[PDB]
Amino acid sequence: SMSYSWTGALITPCSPEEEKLPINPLSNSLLRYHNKVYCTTSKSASLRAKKVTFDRMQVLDAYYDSVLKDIKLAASKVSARLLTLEEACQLTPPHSARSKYGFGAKEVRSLSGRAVNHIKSVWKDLLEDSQTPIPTTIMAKNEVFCVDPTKGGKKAARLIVYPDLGVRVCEKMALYDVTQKLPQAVMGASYGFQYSPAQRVEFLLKAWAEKKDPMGFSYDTRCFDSTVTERDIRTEESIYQACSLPEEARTAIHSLTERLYVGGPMFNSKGQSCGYRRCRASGVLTTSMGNTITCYVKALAACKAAGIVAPTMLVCGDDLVVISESQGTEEDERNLRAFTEAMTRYSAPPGDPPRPEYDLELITSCSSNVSVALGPQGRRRYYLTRDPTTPIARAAWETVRHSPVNSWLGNIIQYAPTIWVRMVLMTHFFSILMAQDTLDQNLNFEMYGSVYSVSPLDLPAIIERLHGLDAFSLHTYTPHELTRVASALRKLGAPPLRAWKSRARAVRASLISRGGRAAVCGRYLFNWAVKTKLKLTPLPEARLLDLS
Ligand SMILES: CC(C)N(C(=O)c1ccc(Cl)cc1Cl)c1cc(-c2ccccc2)sc1C(=O)O
Q: How activity is regulated?
């Protein structure tokens, strides 16, 4: 019932935390320098704790039972296997939090004796004990945002809850295969984490077009992880158990469910007993899959209870969008409140109350929205974009504080066709790379299921294969997109687009002078920066394929 119980001990940091940069070399233009970026820290952990701690009142109904029945039948169609200890170790990222048992990710990836033996006892313990809660560490996340004076004060840090490295590897052995198959099997096209930007755009355009009179809305659950109940989490296990699994996997899955997923004790970085959790833990293997399926079940049942007409939904964890047949504004709003009231009963109360949308460009899904622009031939071309405030705020931060994994590279790749990536991020970072003289250096970035390594000098080929040549010729963006980008730059205290356009010229010429791949990057990535455009032909793009 209560999402959390606290002892009073503080959520302590592990390393000295930095909340502001000494100098922001992106929010700078000769006579106008600013620094409105900030990073969340332990200091606001108590504030977040207060926010996520509340009573959950859950009451299900026939609409829910029905949808749950359908989902379990769909789940019975899946077969999954145990992952080999070796396979689970190999899936352990290079720097994931070390264990308190004398080893780190390095030792797990190389299968050192100490690590392997420890992992084996943890697995054996899971098979022998299905009751003893597994301890978790709770910590404040350090994430970068931009102050938004109008929308409110700085955001409190998100809280991360995760078990020891040894337990994490065992989770993969028992459930990794399931996480790669179950969501799509029960949700199909509605499973949002299966689409590339072009496919996501296509799904949305298609869903919108099939309605005679389309109406969409995004539903935002206030603190989704805190809203999922113990019942929800055991119900997730019953959905997992519907799959065809080896008895050994079933045992570990039940143990992991009763000892970890359903809840458990939390300790701060100092080892002090911090509290007890009775909701979703942010740092466990099943978080993404669990949230996605549970959000889908509740959302679909709510659609039925509210009488939403012909709903086509897209779900990304707790992020949900529903596009259906409009019944007129008056009726749509009535239907949306019924939907909300149903979601609430299912323990999925709304943060920002949902409102009907009748312009596709204004609907945000999985943090993005569809927009339109013209191709070199003058025809319309759709693409995925998003508010650039946070991506740029972080790009600025990662300019000073070099981090192992860059977010800017990821944003450039995922949003390559956007005007903000093209005029700002590409111009800025290629200028920085030439200044540091590290152009061909391979960098690591993330697309949330992996950490990739790529050389910026390979961006034109990567972008072509990912978004097509049109990514280098898009023009005539919408005023909504232009206004949003311009507003983000103001909030950030960064130079306006007209200034970046001037800068792009120099960056382009500098890249060309260097010849080679650098020249290709210049001619292709910045063809928008010169009045007399170069032609631009297909590249050796037909030589690669991505997973994420
Ligand atoms: C109207 C022309 C001059 N234009 C472009 O050619 C252009 C297209 C794509 C990219 Cl990535 C960059 C540029 Cl400069 C455009 C200039 C714009 C602009 C420039 C400075 C401030 C605000 C908007 S918006 C815009 C467009 O085609 O949509």
A: Activity is up-regulated by PRK2/PKN2-mediated phosphorylation.
How many Cβ atoms from other residues are within 10 Å of residue 400's Cβ? 14
> Are the beta carbons of 316 and 366 closer than 8 angstroms?
yes
Compute, in degrees rounded to 10, the torsion defined by CA atoms 233, 234, 238, 240. 40
Residue 100 burial (CB count, 10 A):
12
Q: How far apart are CA 327 and CA 320, in angstroms?
A: 20
Q: How far apart are CA 360 and CA 198, in angstroms?
A: 16
Find the angle CA(226)-CA(230)-CA(233) to the nearest 5 degrees: 90
370, amino acid identity: V
Q: Whose alpha carbon is nearest atom 25 of ligand 1?
A: 476
CA distance 226 to 54: 8
Give, as one character, the DSSP assignment of residue 159.
E
Query: Residues with Cβ < 8 Å from 419, sequence gap 6 or more?
Result: 474, 477, 481, 482, 485, 497
Q: How many CB atoms lie within 10 A of CB 516?
A: 12
The distance from CA 332 to its chain's CA centroid, rounded to whole angstroms, is 29
CA distances in angstroms from 131 to 21, 134, 260, 472, listed in the order given: 46, 9, 9, 57
Number of H helices, E strands in the chain: 20, 17
Q: Which of 282, 287, 316, 285 is nearest to 299 (CA)?
A: 316
Elucidation method? X-ray
Please give the biggest Cα pair distance in the chain: 72
Q: Structure tokens of 122?
A: 């943890």
Six-digit token pair at 353? Answer: 């109350």
Distance 526 CA to ligand 1 centre (A): 12
Determine the residue type at 344: T
User: For the chain, how many residues are written?
Assistant: 548
DSSP string across 16-58: ----S-S--TTSEETTEE---EEE--GGGHHHHHHHH--B---
Question: Are residues 239 and 75 in contact, defined by beta-carbon separation less than 8 angstroms?
Answer: yes
Quote the tokens at residue 121.
């006892």
User: What does this entry list as its resolution, in Å?
Assistant: 2.2
Strands 136-140, 264-267: parallel, antiparallel or unpaired by DSSP? parallel
Q: How many Å apart are CA 451 and CA 434, to the nearest integer? A: 24
Beta-bridge mates of residue 365: 368
Annotated binding site for Mg(2+), which residues?
220, 318-319
- Is-contact 105 93, C-beta < 8 A? yes
Residues with CB under 6 A from ligand 1: 419, 422-423, 474-477, 482, 497-498, 501, 528
Token representation of residue 365: 């899904």
Ligand 1 atom closest to Cα of residue 501? 14
Asked whether the beta carbons of 369 and 385 are under 8 A apart, the reply is yes
Give the per-residue SS3 of 347-385. Answer: CCCECCCCCCECCHHHCCECCEEEEEEECCCCCEEEEEE
